[model samples]
Target: EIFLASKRAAITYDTDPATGEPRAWLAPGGTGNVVAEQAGVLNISWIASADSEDDRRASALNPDGVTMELHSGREILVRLIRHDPAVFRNVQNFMTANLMWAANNYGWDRWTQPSFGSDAREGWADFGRFTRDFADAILKSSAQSADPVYLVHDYQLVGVPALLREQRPDAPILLFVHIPWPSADYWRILPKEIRTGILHGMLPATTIGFFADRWCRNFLESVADLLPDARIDREAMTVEWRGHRTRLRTMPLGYSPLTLPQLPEGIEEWADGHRLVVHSGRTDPIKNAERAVRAFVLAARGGGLEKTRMLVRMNPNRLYVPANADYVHRVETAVAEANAELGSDTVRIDNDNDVNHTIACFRRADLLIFNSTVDGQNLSTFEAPLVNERDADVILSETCGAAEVLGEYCRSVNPFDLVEQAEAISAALAAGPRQRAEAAARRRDAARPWTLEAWVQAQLDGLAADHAAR
Candidate 1:
């Protein structure tokens, strides 16, 4: 039986070539890290940062950097930036402070950075180097350790598992893909060598694989079919090859609600009795936040309700903030056009603001809009229905992982189909009390399968089952 399991922790760092310094960063957190650590699993991750100073500075300002400590006493070994004469300590300090803020305010554990590959390769070359270095490190570490199980997360660590497997043949490796595995069409975008390398690299370590949803599973299966001697078990979520079987499954992520203090009494009475529609998420292109705003404007123009207000909440993210001048210009231009076309002050867009105020706004909202091009699983979509005073209707995109369960109650729409989405929003707003009640009931029932506790338990159970089968 396997006694220890380790996951590769990777971060995208932005670095300056001339100065040989890291500029910005992006790290995985929330559900993936939380579950691994909670399972008392050893987490070994490598750092992959960007190659830009301004980007690094912006990342430093955000709370995305942190250490990982499991509730079950598992410790995380993170490879992060080290403060040296060449490397600025202030950047590390900035990251640590933001990480501490997240931990104190929202229970989280931060990791320590270890130096590895230099930021010499730019773009694809850089990505290739990072993958190679990660694989080398995992192989070197596993050769010296007694651990017999490896857990890899995301596309960044795809190379590491296979590299380790060559040296540690008995090791049981599992990979959980947090992002959408684009179709083979998108996969073909990478150079042939790199594309083949990723698949081969994964095939070696992947005794079991997990995707966010069925759509992703199908994409993986399609790609796996091209490889020789590869086998997949959709029913048990396992894949078999060379007399070894790997599991594959779709398990969406979930969130825990904060125990918020009550808002001031009579606050609800003063709220503008408008049928409030709300959209909250990162302001990334994939989120389709811009499309959501346009759809809200279209819905408002029909004007069946006297006081219908749409609130677009742009959550704080380092990449989206400081509002790229061009991006801000685009969003502003779109909002102006939307308001003008609607000919009303019905649509309002909000920026980085108080968390309490945002939650209060969610409480007052009647409909929650989540139109994204793609998402692993969005927590806000679920949180709105649970917190809103009235039974809230969600306008969910088919591409989002949350739609796996929320599809039943939500007005599912193709995010690219703006007119159809607008019409869906209008129809949902005009829905009667009975219909709204049934939608709410459906949502509550759908939510039954997902919870933070259940999500954590599933990971533990999956690990246990893997051990028992061996």
Candidate 2:
């Protein structure tokens, strides 16, 4: 089975009480629609929020708060929460909405487990239940189906594979992780029991484990050291267990830039006669958005291009708000400080719902800054260069997975070295169009082999090989 999973689907809502209805929204059309288009069936399940007052009250306390609109005639009042607890409750509400959307849109089986009603940290209990439920579902379903392979996606489903192996020892299971696998030092922060549980749960059934970069692979190897049966292959990027070799490969996520529409007229007009610098990602501490702004400030000062604008498009990941409140505050404070230091009018920080506008910004940018402290193969580094009309300069972090592949085309710098980044930005700004064009050519060439179609074929080939061996 070609299984696709994530912690949660991105969601939005549109309510019209005038029509006497409240409807849920999903990304693009819905998660189920996306899955159907990909030609894969899905069985989705997660933690459910209690329909209680305490949940509603907790949702109101979030930083960005929560909003749900009701329309009467032409009037709409979107209720906003001021407290943090309410923010998390609203998150659960949104997730529930997504589950409904998936079930309705795709006709896929869906499940939800009970979550602790009052304790925010108790949310993990729900995630734990998800693991157990996923395992049970796989065992029950695989017992009847003829499908030869099973796949799991993301860290949330890490334990399911091991659980599946315990019941069905011969099935080939592949696991894919989308987020950054922190270095061994960072991972050591987890309690030994929890860490080992995750590691052991993954090793048994993971015939092939996909990571975003070598750094992530290194981290996995460190954890694998705890299991004597674990085996790793560096060159071919495969892991072995019980004399069976499972491929371990780095497959950076790819975007189809050819599908995006051309840059909007307004953005082109707005960008006239001035170099546009752009940064877009979740407004989280790890992204180091403030560093991008600081680098812009330094570049402007050195080049006497103070009129140049730096556009930062940031949206918080809705799921992380409960656990990352302090990080959320740090990001907001950094944005506030940057806006204060640079005239607020000159530095634009927007949270717009329109993704086309974001892509337009990427197309219009003279330089795209992807200066994250860490990242799992960021798609922007490839996307920006692909769309830019001019040879776009990419300021990339050395630690990012994409850097290992795209470093030759990018001005790679240490994420902490704001001064070095500034210097690179200045140099890139001063470089002639010919140099930029050459860099863009090189970037396009480097990215050709890593296309989504190629990666999917690679995965299928491995599955086919497993079938042959059996």
Candidate 3:
């Protein structure tokens, strides 16, 4: 058994069966799903907030948290963390503007500093308190369990290690960053205190993990450049900061191929005869959906993929807000222009967050475009081939974390290059069935071994090895 922590819980809300209170059901996510499937094999007490945006829901339902029995007849505990609703909004805005923007290289003009007034300062302070809340919960649990192995996840919780170390000096902490770590030059734009704080926050960990080798190298360089006091041993891949050594490793997450349920009825109508091209994910600026639309349009207009139609499935969860509204509008405009330019309903958009629809699109797709500017491990690339009946071709961004594992099997392209992306799409559609199947088979073979069970086990093994060595 181990203690797992992340921003969101591995559950969703519903009416309680016994108490009639609003309770949660097992609705595991990327990391949460990994922990969820370890039933009987690995017992875990997963900690997170069921509803961070709405304090009323998580706090009201279970002030302590829930203890549910998994399908494998093993027990899993969920420790829900609460935050002030207003503060939650502020921290989300602050993080989206600062950490996420800088880390992903969202915009070219990186050094521009906005005024840090009362609201911004409050957000920073609340950010501290938010992480502390998680740390305090974990520490209390650790004291009860007498467990020293702490696993922290993502950029949102970078501050966890230092907080834990301040209490339990010998705690073996492993912080896994599930997003792209930008280069030192890109990281330098942040205020000195902020960037250095992030570095100092993560440095206290025993080992820091990344999804791709590129991100691992970027973090190493960033730490070396920003924190000059830290001594980097390239051969050992360890950082010596404040007399503590933090091991850096590339631990890419893998996917589990799924057997999808009955799909939506109207999905087949989407690809009546034309080759179906699909791109689906959250409608975030980082997704580069507008550019994807342009590239698909370019490919179609260039006379190669004339028989192809694109279906862009987007889940616009609060995407109309200030931080992301403009980007959404741009994507919509691009879709409009593409349809007008093609002189047909060649490009379509689906706003529903339908899981079945996504899979159905994948199954029907002759090509899948996942041209994110930068991402963690994109499961869409791993997933499309697993279900596609047509043996869908994948056009992935060279910078995506999935590209590290599936690049050879995909038509890798620069996310910023419309021409290159267009050419790849055209070439993929023009490729013979044998070439497509070979690529798909190789990708599937590579991904099949990197299961959620293996991912969790590898981390556990790494922790054990590190603890033993110490």
Candidate 4:
């Protein structure tokens, strides 16, 4: 399973490259949580940060395994944007500000306009080198008789399909774009050249997957705008660019079986029957952390909750984005504003980077609130039911892609409509434990066939079919 990078315990340098000085920074883990469940060797090859240094301990011949490889001239991929750090905060924010708008809705003209920091062509050139090398390596990797079927995810590697096929002419590719795909109405602002290239780059795939049919149709509609030869079989869910046909499929991405993380010290007593509530993970704009707090404030004032408590667990990672800065502050402000009139300590905020605490919250909470503005697939829908204290009812946002698949169990509402969310939160708390548990259990069973192992096996089988067809 290939992705950007599998781990966070990034082997980094202790020496300063610029001043030749010694130093150290924060460190951490990733990937094996899901990849290992595949029941075989997990082979993933993708890029690591340019600042990272590998210890080269990957000496074993495990037939498959992973990262973006080494180069003395890696400067080609590494040397762009802000503050000399891994992320070009200013530039990235500039980039994401426009991109995130496009992501949340249709912003085609906005995407191609001047980014104010750099042109799409600039970062586009650097990432091309990354995807190009990956294609060269995989296509050339000893596929003597059988053609290799490349499966790529997200926009990071948009150009890789064509790159790989260029290297091995018989190659087939599968792409699952894990984000919002805008419609033909949204196709105006993009650089016509780049837009054409992306559509062209994507046409080579056998089956292109999106999380919802809305996205599947969006892709075909956009393609029809760009390619005069585009013909769509919406009935069959297929789109053909020129003569090559690609089935536009929907793959509502699934989650793994949630395992209980050992509870961290100091929180053993939250188990007392005081309807616990939680909001974990992203505080980014789309995650709607601010709105989440406001809805809870409204819910609290309406009175069903007396002893009930809340924890808004957010971690600040997207430093470049302006909204991310205010996310925590707004959540705290809402919490304070609510408590000033209500009881102090009724709602709290935390940024502790503790997985154990997170899982503990998932296990102990009576309700999990995931009110995203727009999301590809929020894990909370899949995760909460599995680990919830007793089938903790969920307050989900209708804008979330996962809600389309896991909607029945959640008290789904439009994210922008705070009154709806406030009522849902109140209802969730007022529910008896058995009703909540019964509600949550139905989703867990609905998600049973889509485990991480099943996902991996499905990919493996898809690739096998790709080769067998030849």
Candidate 5:
């Protein structure tokens, strides 16, 4: 039998603590997609949520890790690794700061930044503890299975692979990063030891996967820039490091098709009465919500959108990260100013955007904008079109992962170029109904090939090939 390991579903702890049972929300990301879909088919072991420690409820529920029966009548394991809450916060802040910087541009003057001194040192120490906990959890969970496949995900656990390798030398490790991997020059912003350590940590993996070719290429270039002695073959997508060859893969995750429900009476009225432009996602700097507002304002003030309304629904759940609050303030400020300038509630901001409302907006949207400055892949671009009735016009940032596949069909714009984004929005809105439907059908057809089942099979097939080779 084969065992698969990964981080647990992305969860929050705002439920009834009195019941001592934590609830897992259906989050807006690819990790949740994989976790939900694979549970029915594979033997999965996932790290329990840190929120499980909120009331020490995890231990109370099951002194040993919790075991639950899946829909397929198979069992899944939850590894409840314990740690200090403060330490988790510190490590989270540190990693997010560094990772966010790597996701964007940098310059020589970045050396003068204040965040890298004492705070970073404490964060790194805490990070070591965090990764050690994860590694131990994986080892403990996998001990019962005859053959286990360790599949790590995202930037948070980059350090776990090396630790796992030290304990289980022959284990097959696959790490898939769900965000943009920056270029070599940008990655050098980190201290030399830290950068090298991260590369060394990941190099132990049998295969490191990304959502696009560019991100995979960036990893190779970064490896060359940091560890000069490592042999890199771009054609083969392999890196020879420390007497081991690691494969690099570009595997884009696909959408889970959703069925639309009846639109809420109020939202239905609004949609039927007026033209709607929509943008919804987490409130973070990379998402460029502020810029989206600016571009919408430019289009509105320039005229021809008299009956149009821009609905911006942003999630502020990531308030722990300092940048999130700062970014939210900037976005809300722009929205307020734009509404004032336009002399009505032209730009409406919804902080409490639920699943039903979000889907309703997408289904009825006359124009949909997903303009993230840097993204792994915005699932919205893939999903919004499926349920759209009018074949709403879509816009994507050139840097988003979806653009690599859907750009030929969708309007691709540079997130930083307000004029380009505004012009694209105007042009999309101006197209005739017949023309819009034709383009929309083509875009829908393009996305139809990449399904959730196909993505799952791809990962499994890659893992099987890599495991057999070793």
Candidate 6:
């Protein structure tokens, strides 16, 4: 419910011209894991402005509540309301966009790389202040009996905790960073203002959680490097900065293997003796879509892998970010280069990566390669083993969060090592039927305990622990 809230969308759309009146509708891609897992929180968000007068009134008259069904057919409750729109437009255009770019790029770039200038950091500062006001205003309108806990997501709103601190110092704040933390060396590359601001902005939280232990360490390392008065105990996984301690935890998120969709039309049509290799989901820099193509090319040239066929449906753009377009081009170029070298059309480099086709690929794939250079979690790791009729062998990256659990059965490879990644694909093709069946069964059995319910409960437990800690 809260996932749909937060007044920061391109919430300023003009209404349908056909009607010449206000419109209330659901966004098609609105379904997500949060929508799936939310256990009935009466979440709310506001609208400050819109492109047309109808849109303004449309948002105003939009119901105090909404009743929607999930992709799974389960109905859920949610809410939206009006609030001070204030600077939300600027927050969307400049502050939010620029800060997120800097935060994401700041991780991979070297110190020698150009720094974020005065304007970007100022936007970061402004975005923070706006969010603080947003939070305070929401609380102002909230019910009186509630002594609520604040749960923040991602890097864009880092300033929130500090702002909330001034308003209610005693309020419990918990933040979970969904992305990987940069190594201290790369984090040091950041301009002091941006780095220190994000670090301090986060300090007010009672507890912080990272997607994996490595990120937890990286986040702690960043704090130790930037804070002069900080005291950290490596064994305790706790940090004391500015006379207060915050607990840190690593909670590896999971998916429900039980939620598998029915296989697409061609699942049985494609996999007879064909080593159907598949890569699904995001096609960005971190996912190394180029590596996925090039590595598979190498595997195709190998002894047993010569007959294996690959289908590449990695898409071209995401988050309206230009980086993904560049990734798509790089990935397409790799496909062309490999096919040119092969001197024939050996691989099917496709462009459609919809959920239905992806699920079909999961059901049919003889070998599935989910190799990300860096990632929080890859759901396909859990999904492939559960649905594949052929009991697909999964070649996964060592850096993925699922590696800690499902890596035992997966032929895990370091994504940076191209030859190793491709060679594992070949080995998957070469493995005996019994070996394939056993490995796939190991993965399915291992994934049984890591349910969506378990993951949500773990998060709630973490929230409680953080709330109780001083």
TM-score, one value per model: 0.70, 0.73, 0.90, 0.78, 0.89, 0.83
* Best of the two (3, 5) by lDDT: 3
**Ranking by lDDT, best first?**
3, 5, 6, 4, 2, 1
Q: How accurate is candidate 5 locally (lDDT)?
A: 0.72
- Angstrom error of the Cα, residue 14, model 2: value is 6.2
Cα deviation of 429 in candidate 3 (Å)?
0.6
Each candidate's lDDT (Cα)?
0.56, 0.57, 0.74, 0.60, 0.72, 0.63
- Angstrom error at residue 386, model 3: 1.6
Candidate 5 per-residue lDDT, tens place, 1-470, comes to 44344444554435534555544333444354455455444545556435345425644566565554332233455555565778766765665544434333221245555345766566667778888878887787778766677877777778888988887777788887877788887776766666777888888888888888888899999998888789999999989987877899888765765322555445555556678888878777777888988998899878988888888877666666666778888998999999888867788777753556667777878899998888887777887887788888789888888888888899999999998999988988888688899999998998777776676677778867876776
**Steric overlap count per candidate:** 33, 15, 0, 8, 0, 1
Which of the two, 3 or 4, has more TM-score? 3
In candidate 4 the C-alpha lDDT for residue 112 amounts to 50
Q: Report the error of model 6 at residue 295, Å.
A: 1.0
Q: How well is each residue in 154-206 modelled by candidate 2, as lDDT tens digits? A: 55566777787777777777666655565454444344444566666766654
Question: Model 4 Cα displacement at 219 (Å)?
Answer: 1.8
Off by over 4 Å in 4: 1-118, 140-146, 258-273, 462-470
Q: Highest TM-score, which number?
A: 3
CA error at residue 15 for candidate 1, angstroms: 27
lDDT of 6 at 328: 72
Against the true structure, whose lDDT is highest?
3
- Residue 238, model 6, lDDT: 90
User: Model 5 segments beyond 4 Å from truth?
Assistant: 1-30, 63-77, 98-115, 258-272
Clashing pairs in 6: 48-85
Over 377-464, each residue of candidate 6 has an lDDT whose tens digit, in order, gives 6766887778788878998898887887778878999988889988888778888678889878888888667766676566668867
Per-residue CA lDDT of model 3 for 1-470, tens digit only, reads 36667775445556767888655566423445555554324666677754553334655565565665443334566677776667666666765644445455455453454434566456667878888888987888788656568888777888898998898777788898878888888876655666787888888888888888888888889999998799998777889888887888887666654323444555567568888888887767777889999988888877977677888878665464554677788888999999889966788877775666677777888888999988877877777777788877889899889899888878899999999998988898998688888888877786666666677677777767765554
